[PDB]
Amino acid sequence: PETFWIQRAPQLPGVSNIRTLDTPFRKNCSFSTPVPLSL
Amino acid sequence: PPVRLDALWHMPHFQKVGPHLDTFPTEADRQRAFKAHREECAVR
Amino acid sequence: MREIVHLQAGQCGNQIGAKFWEVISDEHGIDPTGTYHGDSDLQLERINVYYNEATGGKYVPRAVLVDLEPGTMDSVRSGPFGQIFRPDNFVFGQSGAGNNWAKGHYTEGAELVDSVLDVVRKEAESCDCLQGFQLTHSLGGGTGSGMGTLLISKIREEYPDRIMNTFSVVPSPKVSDTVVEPYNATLSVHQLVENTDETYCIDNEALYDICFRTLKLTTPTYGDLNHLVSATMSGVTTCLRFPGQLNADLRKLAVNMVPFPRLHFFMPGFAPLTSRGSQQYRALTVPELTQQMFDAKNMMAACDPRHGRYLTVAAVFRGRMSMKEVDEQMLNVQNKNSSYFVEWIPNNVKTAVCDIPPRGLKMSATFIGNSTAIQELFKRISEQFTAMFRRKAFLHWYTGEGMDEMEFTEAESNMNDLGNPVVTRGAC
Amino acid sequence: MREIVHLQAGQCGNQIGAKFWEVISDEHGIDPTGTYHGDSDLQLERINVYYNEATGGKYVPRAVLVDLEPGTMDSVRSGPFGQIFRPDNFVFGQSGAGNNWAKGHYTEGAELVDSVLDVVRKEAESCDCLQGFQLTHSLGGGTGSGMGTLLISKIREEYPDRIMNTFSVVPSPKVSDTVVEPYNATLSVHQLVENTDETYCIDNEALYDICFRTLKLTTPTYGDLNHLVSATMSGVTTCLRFPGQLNADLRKLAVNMVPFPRLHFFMPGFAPLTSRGSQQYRALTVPELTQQMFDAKNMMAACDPRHGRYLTVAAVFRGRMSMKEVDEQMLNVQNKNSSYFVEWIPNNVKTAVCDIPPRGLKMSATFIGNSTAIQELFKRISEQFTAMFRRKAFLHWYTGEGMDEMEFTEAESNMNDLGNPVVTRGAC
Amino acid sequence: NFINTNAANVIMGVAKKPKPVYVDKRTGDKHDLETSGLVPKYINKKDYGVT
Amino acid sequence: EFDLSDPLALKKDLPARQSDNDARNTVSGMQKFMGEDLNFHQRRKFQEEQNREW
Amino acid sequence: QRECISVHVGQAGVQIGNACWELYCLEHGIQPDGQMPSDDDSFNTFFSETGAGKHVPRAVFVDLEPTVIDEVRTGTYRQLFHPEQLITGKEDAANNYARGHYTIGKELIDLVLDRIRKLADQCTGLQGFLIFHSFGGGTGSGFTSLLMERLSVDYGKKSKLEFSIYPAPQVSTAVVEPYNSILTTHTTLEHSDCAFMVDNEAIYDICRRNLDIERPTYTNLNRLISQIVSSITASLRFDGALNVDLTEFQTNLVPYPRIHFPLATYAPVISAEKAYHEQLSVAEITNACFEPANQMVKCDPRHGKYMACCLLYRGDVVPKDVNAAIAAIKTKRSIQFVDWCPTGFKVGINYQPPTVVPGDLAKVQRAVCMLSNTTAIAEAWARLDHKFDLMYAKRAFVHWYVGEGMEEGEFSEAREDMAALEKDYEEVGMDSVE
């Protein structure tokens, strides 16, 4: 669905890291990700 | 008409302040000058 | 040189201060990667107020980034100016806020506050003289209320002679994003009162009203809502960052605006604002600035100054301007509106002027107002708290985290004991 | 330096003001884009009466366009001189008056007048010495009557020492565009009496009389009918706007035109009017201006002055011209027609001479007349009202909005109280 | 009555005896006075001139 | 200091947002926001044809 | 043998200082580098040759907050002021006399008194210490008091004038000004000599009407205050006919102990266009200094009596035309004068025509500067009191002062002595009826 969010997605406040390409609204919990529990 | 306020609000606590400049001679001379102060400041 | 330690708690505070760092790095010429590329030498003259110098000519913002949900830190790190903050300063915990003041104040929030204070102590003892602290949060909800007020208390106890500005987003009457906004706001205002020195109440009602009536946006969203708060954040801390005539920093605003220690709740405003259709119809001057500052459409709290006398007003102008216009317009406001200002503070308007305006703009001005009208903001929260508290609604988890009824009663009593002074000073 | 805040009520008032602003923009040389393209420096000498300066040399009218329907704002914005007004003072309402003085005065009018008063307060604040206000409205119909008179009352409350010029389209006997125009006119004449300083009664019937017989137009339009009105608007307020000898502004005309505090209804007239087939046979001079001005066919109200006594007469000539001829073509009238003039005021004619003429014309004049014959209009409106009121009709949708029965009775009582002091003076 | 409470608070308060700090350079460099040797502090001891 | 004393200052000043893509207007100069949807109508048309197609 | 140490304290000061020392320079030639472009010793009154041909200003700019002084350390005149004569600090003083006479002010006092001593141990004959400040600000009201008092402890009965920005009669740029102002007058009433007073609102009007500047800033005003410091010091820099030193302004003005607040007023303050139509003659220039629309301190001199007025004619002023003017002004029964002062008009006729800074004001071949001590300054002290009381009544904004070192009581003792000052202006006014 083409939305206002998906247009302004790399500038929105509550958007995580866009590592993939189709949806910028995926979840990229890689920075948080405490160092003992990380791959 | 543009009416005037009375004297500006000063403290009623600080209206009893004594002198720090005794420029005048004797005390009766001082009140006789201040009688003219009242009467001449009264307009006309 | 003076510097300010910036703190941001909660999703609201994190996003607002992210936009704030975006705004102020735009002002200071700092790129996303942290280095400097600008045009004037008057930008690095006072860059050590918000940016710690690193190796290779890099400027890392001095900010402590606190939240209990491990997604808002991720969003801040992935934002526009994400690769500019210290990774160590991203302090968090894999837990939940649960929009709960008890869960932010007597739980894992208190288990995270020690690491947060370690980071704060690093940035506060990497100094020579610290002016104070600048915490951004939202009262309605968790983290920003719980962690925010707990951090407020411990930082105030550790550093007792430094200025402290809290930008608090306070719950809104007509619409509420969370149910327990009155509970959180009532429990947070009690800590706000007898700790901080300058509290800025920003309301989403007034933010959306500036978006609709003044700016005429089509789809306003949280980026623009935080942009409007970053307006006044930049406007207040400008005299200690850029030169001016008749400078005034944080403490010199606080002295002129806080007549009594309980009264420091302000209503911010920023007023070279106009819609894109009305942009070419403008006549940008200092009288137009004062006209937009002193109306009740630009002030960023849902409190009408028509319902209360102005205790103190401060106007921090930013541009090359004549001081004659500024002095005569601030006199003209006081003279044309007589019943809206208190009589026991003669000439209750303060003036500051900085020379360098915000970039891309000829001339700006920010407004701060301590008024009687901060009545309603605490009152509506008090009746909503009383309504939800008479029937014990949404409270079993509040007592499950380790609270008592008497703390709620004390919070309501202190809300009322804040309301009564701003009742009585509004009636001579 | 003086200023005139121009406000427009109703669809008729908005169209009248649109043609007025086209006339003034042409007269001062302002293009539809808003900037200046002129031939003389006298156009920019006193342009700060109807316009305020903006960026880039762009002059904006100080007009507040007010309507209760969002359909006339769109037409004015889509008009020729549409991109010259502010986008903010297009104060509309998402409602409808529906041809109702009750719905103009005691309903949605009551909360749209607050926004209009905010706009008018801003416009009057941006003026150092405001001469007054100029409202264009139609007496017969909604919006212009109810909201117009409510706005008049509240502006009188806010500003007591400023002139109020009210151009009023009084309804005609011959043809009717609204059935309830007697109720609207009767309720509006009382508020025109017990408020304003000068009221100019323009009539659609007399505008058609001028456009059919004098101009010899085939298919006259509302553009032409508004053009005739805008001509005398400029002719009245041209001495304060262009230099000349024996100047007379609004207050001077009011002082020399009302003998008594209620008798401020006038009969305008602008008559250097030629047909296009009669322009090449015109011998335009000072006696021709006076005779066409004083003929009882170029009047703008259906009040034949030969049935009454001219209480006072004022005339504002425009052009470079000879003063014996000025004084003599009025002394000739005063002595030749002695029974149409009151005897208790000798030399009852006021003279003004503006130097700068209307462009495209060599020489012009405008007329203001306070006469006994204006009581004909009020007897006619009173007879219409007493025809419709005795059967208690067209009345449920006047009493259901918040009015009362007796309100119409005191409106009619003051309406016939106007009957005394303009008949007693007509019969000494 | 908050006027009377604030008035009593400011009436019945002693201020600080503030901490003595001195500035040596033109820039503003602050240094504490007691810990620096530029003050008589260890002259007034109890073991001066006596074992 | 004739710049802040010039009678012709307003005739040489420029509006803050002279054009829709002014280079002066930035995040600091608060005359260009992000919620002002220039792409509103084209976005609605794109959404409507998407709805249609799907 | 005629040097004058100047201690500029506070934004106002540092800023009036910039203006004052620019005029000082353009007058003696000293370029914005010291090096005088000669290829003689008059400059000594304000400058001190190093021998390498560098003339260093004899001043001590002091401001607890940076910014203002820092823009002087990086500007046109960045090589004139010896670094250690521009003594700034780190933290401000939040418009709080308290943190200017007690806390963040008693730290810079040691170093400033230090610099002042070195700039004194190089003088072969000091005339006095011209202190420039603003009655309404931390450093302006705080550091000045401490500086003034500590100076008296050292330099004892040495002259110490005080050019000041008196609180405004309506405008004001602070909400706590009234307090700082009353507190300052108290600590300096007995420690200062002749404190000259210039109100800003006044200069603002004098600049809109006489100098055709519709929107005046602080610089237009500052530069006019520099012309006044020139006339007051002109005699001890240029030759004249009736020299007036900086020890006579304390004797031929300050009448009785406390009363020491002269008021300033300049002459030929015209504006090019309106100077092609004016004979700016000794009389015109003088009558103007006594007009109740030029007094650079809004205080209608008509609502009071003159106590002592010392005029200073700078330029081509025939000595006879001076005697004539003062006579005319005396006759005029509008201008009043106390009885205990038969002779109340002092005159100083120097010769160097007013200097024209490449900026504003006309090139006049004549100009006067009056410094009267009108009893009409009483209205100002009363207005300051209304303010101090309207707030002290609810002990408002006092927490901040008790929050530094000002024991609540001090506020009382201050306004109480300000009331004494007002009662004094009443006595010095009444005329013996005998």
Ligand SMILES: Nc1nc2c(ncn2[C@@H]2O[C@H](COP(=O)(O)OP(=O)(O)OP(=O)(O)O)[C@@H](O)[C@H]2O)c(=O)[nH]1
């Ligand atoms: N001519 C001139 N007057 C000034 C200037 N700045 C301030 N003033 C006047 O002085 C008053 C306050 O100035 P100061 O007392 O010097 O301010 P400060 O002591 O440096 O205190 P802060 O800068 O606020 O920390 C104002 O009310 C002004 O009227 C200036 O730059 N030039």
Ligand SMILES: Nc1nc2c(ncn2[C@@H]2O[C@H](COP(=O)(O)OP(=O)(O)O)[C@@H](O)[C@H]2O)c(=O)[nH]1
């Ligand atoms: N100005 C602004 N307000 C926001 C933003 N995001 C959220 N808010 C406000 O934050 C409030 C709730 O935040 P909260 O639940 O306390 O977040 P938490 O602290 O992480 O638990 C809502 O009422 C929003 O109005 C933003 O980006 N800008």
Ligand SMILES: Nc1nc2c(ncn2[C@@H]2O[C@H](COP(=O)(O)OP(=O)(O)O)[C@@H](O)[C@H]2O)c(=O)[nH]1
């Ligand atoms: N001169 C002139 N009169 C007009 C024009 N348009 C409408 N009128 C008059 O306005 C009357 C009806 O307008 P009205 O219903 O009162 O509009 P409203 O005030 O918005 O309710 C008609 O009788 C017309 O004579 C115009 O363009 N010029």
